[PDB]
Every structure is written in structure tokens, then in C-alpha cells.
Design a protein around this ligand. Structure first.
Ligand SMILES: COC(=O)C(Cc1ccccc1)(Cc1ccc(NS(=O)(=O)O)cc1)C(=O)OC
Length: 278
């Protein structure tokens, strides 16, 4: 199994079924995805030299799908989307000691858009280094110089633009700030409108490499972001929605994508609201 495609007109009822008896069928479903991708090794991320480069010792990219730096090690994975095979690069939240590698990756891979769906610290627990500059002052990261051009705060996300000088790119950073680790946003609408805003900018980024998405580990809130990005496009696009198949494809690429069942529920809730409203 692989893809479970649902007719738009059937989605609501189907979601109800999954929801019946304390989420019984949904629990069964989320559970079929448990073993997807589990055949794959992570030997490179385990090399001694790379140990300090992983934020979590049990969240490591598959060798088969990892992003290589042109010492080639970053904790990052290529991920297919609705449209192409290297549609996203998914990564952990940079560490103080990996932020130069992360920006080196952004530069080499031609990325114009970065989506961050973690806070750097939540309730005191560290999640992600503050790997861009505090303000308008420029900073080096390895052999790159970065300047923050602009920073617009909104209630639920902040959009920054960076200028990178390498060996003249404008990078847009999309920071959603109210997504609790291991949890889900307080509403469907907030993330639905964030994704739609991000997709709009990605749509307008002619020539861009992969979109970067990260959270803390780069699995749960990252994977939910991307599964949502994928499915909202199917909804505009198609007579079907494939949530199971989105999450399945993600898992073939990186461990634990969509990391709690409640994130999997929340995906179904978002489709349902978009479909109720239309
Ligand atoms: C050593 O680290 C772990 O075991 C963690 C988080 C954790 C949990 C309990 C105690 C310590 C760390 C790693 C982890 C996994 C998912 C997230 N959420 S995400 O940032 O949205 O992907 C954060 C952190 C985990 O859940 O692995 C499956």
C-alpha cells in the first residue's frame, strides 16, 4: 500500500469513518505508514566526524536521499512534491556549528525560499539556532555574506528577505511562529493561509532550486507543512485528495515525516475545512 485517493465528494464521510470509535480507523491508517522507508540506512550521518552535526542522534537522513554539500555531510534530505522530485530540501534546525553548512547548502542548491515552522526556543527548550542576523547588520557565514533587507512581522508569521554574496541572490524566509513542537497549530485556517502564501511566492520564483523547509528535527512540522502544500494543490487541481499517499511518499524520503497522529488528523481537518468552506 501506497496512495489512498479520495474523491472530493466522499471526503467528509470518509473522514467521519476514520474518526468513528475514538479515531479507530485513522489510528489503523496512520499505523500502515509506520514501516514505510524503514529498509534504509543512515551510515553517513553516523560517521564519527558527523556526530556533532546532528541535532538529535536518532533523527538522521537516509544515505539514499540526503543532501550533499560540494565534509559533504548536512542533516538534510531531498523530498518530492506534487510537481517534481527535488521539490523540497528538508532539514533540521541549524545548530550553532552547522549554520555555515546550511547557508552553503542554500547557496549551492540555488534555493530562493526557506520555510521555518519552529521557534528557536519554545518555553525554554532549544529547538533551532537563530541562524540568520538579528537585524539589518551584515554577517559572514563561512564564505558567504548575508544582509537582512526586510522583516515583516505578522501575528502568525514573519517574512524576511536576505541578500547573499557568494563565490546577488534574494532569499525569502517564511517563519511561522505559532506551531508547538510535536503538536498542531490552534487552527486549520492559520496554516492553510501560510501555505497558500508560501506556494504563491514559490510559484513566482522562476529558476529557483528546491524550497527549504525546516523545523527542529525536520520531520514532524516540516512533514505536515509539505503534506499540506501538496494536498492543497491537489484540491485546486484534481478530483481527488491523497493524504495517505503524500505522507507515504514523504516517509520514503526521510524518517518520521508527519511525526504524530494528531498531525495526521490535522491534515484531514484542513482538507475538510477547505471543502466545507467551498
Ligand atoms: C533525542 O531526540 C528525540 O528523541 C526527539 C525529541 C525528543 C523527545 C523526547 C525526549 C527527548 C527528545 C527528536 C524530535 C522529533 C520530532 C520533533 N519535531 S519536529 O521538529 O517538528 O520534527 C522534534 C524533535 C524525538 O521525538 O524522536 C523521535
Amino acid at each position: 500500500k501506497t496512495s489512498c485517493p479520495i474523491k472530493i465528494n466522499q471526503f467528509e464521510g470518509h473522514f467521519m469513518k476514520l474518526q468513528a470509535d475514538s479515531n479507530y480507523l485513522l489510528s489503523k491508517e496512520y499505523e500502515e505508514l509506520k514501516d514505510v522507508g524503514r529498509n534504509q540506512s543512515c551510515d553517513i550521518a553516523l560517521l564519527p566526524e558527523n556526530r556533532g552535526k546532528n541535532r538529535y542522534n536518532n533523527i538522521l537522513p537516509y544515505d539514499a536521499t540526503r543532501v550533499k554539500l560540494s565534509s559533504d555531510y548536512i542533516n538534510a534530505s531531498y523530498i518530492p512534491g506534487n510537481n517534481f522530485r527535488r521539490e523540497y530540501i528538508v532539514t533540521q534546525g541549524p545548530l550553532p556549528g552547522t549554520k555555515d553548512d546550511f547557508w552553503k547548502m542554500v547557496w549551492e542548491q540555488n534555493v530562493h525560499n526557506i520555510v521555518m515552522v519552529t521557534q528557536c526556543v519554545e518555553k525554554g527548550r532549544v529547538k533551532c539556532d537563530h541562524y540568520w542576523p538579528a537585524d539589518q547588520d551584515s554577517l559572514y557565514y563561512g564564505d558567504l555574506i548575508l544582509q537582512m533587507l526586510s522583516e515583516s512581522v505578522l501575528p502568525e508569521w514573519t517574512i524576511r528577505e536576505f541578500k547573499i554574496c557568494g563565490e546577488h541572490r534574494l532569499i525569502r524566509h517564511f517563519h511561522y511562529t505559532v506551531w508547538p513542537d510535536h503538536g498542531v497549530p490552534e487552527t486549520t485556517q492559520s496554516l492553510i493561509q501560510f501555505v497558500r502564501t508560501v506556494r504563491d511566492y514559490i510559484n513566482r520564483s522562476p529558476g529557483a532550486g528546491p524550497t527549504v523547509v525546516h523545523c527542529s528535527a525536520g520531520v514532524g512540522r516540516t512533514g505536515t507543512f509539505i503534506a499540506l502544500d501538496r494536498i492543497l494543490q491537489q484540491l485546486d487541481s484534481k478530483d481527488s485528495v491523497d493524504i495517505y499517499g503524500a505522507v507515504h511518499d514523504l516517509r520514503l524520503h526521510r524518517v518520521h515525516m508527519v511525526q504524530t497522529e494528531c498531525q495526521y488528523v490535522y491534515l484531514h481537518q484542513c482538507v475538510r475545512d477547505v471543502l466545507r468552506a467551498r
